[PDB]
Design a protein around this ligand. Structure first.
Ligand code: MG
Ligand code: MG
Ligand code: MG
Ligand code: MG
Ligand code: MG
Ligand code: MG
Ligand code: MG
Ligand code: MG
Ligand code: MG
Ligand code: MG
Ligand code: MG
Ligand code: MG
Length: 70
RNA sequence: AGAUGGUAAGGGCCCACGGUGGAUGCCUCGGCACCCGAGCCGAUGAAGGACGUGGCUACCUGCGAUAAGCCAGGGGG
């Protein structure tokens, strides 16, 4: 993902609530499964997408944790 | 009558060139010694592991379902 889009993800994420973070992670985890399936039948040429999503989910969960941590 | 040479199945010595083999010289990612520095970790679960972890991944390294990585500060260019 582009560095600027990462900052953007963090700012937008940091504005969210725990619950909104949970919904969004769950959606991204879903979107990853779709990607996995496509990789397995050979229809995902754009395979950088998998590394990306996995890190968005990390970043989000990382932030969720920030939120709950205090 | 007499007498003396060309035989090489193969062998031997020498010479040339090779094959095998990995000495020797040079080399060094490594080791060794001394000196200096520095010296605890663990229930906030250690040391050390198992199994995982990559779009394609046998192994090693890294990492832990947030899985060759997540956030922030500093450095660097
Ligand atoms: Mg004769
Ligand atoms: Mg002969
Ligand atoms: Mg002969
Ligand atoms: Mg002889
Ligand atoms: Mg020879
Ligand atoms: Mg020498
Ligand atoms: Mg020590
Ligand atoms: Mg350990
Ligand atoms: Mg491993
Ligand atoms: Mg990042
Ligand atoms: Mg940094
Ligand atoms: Mg920086």
């Amino acid at each position: 993902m582009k560095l600027s889009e990462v900052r953007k993800q963090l700012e937008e994420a940091r504005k969210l609530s725990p619950v909104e973070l949970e919904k969004l992670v769950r959606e991204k985890k879903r979107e990853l499964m779709e990607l996995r399936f496509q990789a397995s039948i050979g229809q995902l040429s754009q395979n950088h997408k998998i590394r990306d999503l996995k890190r968005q989910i990390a970043r989000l969960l990382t932030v969720l944790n920030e939120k709950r941590r205090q």
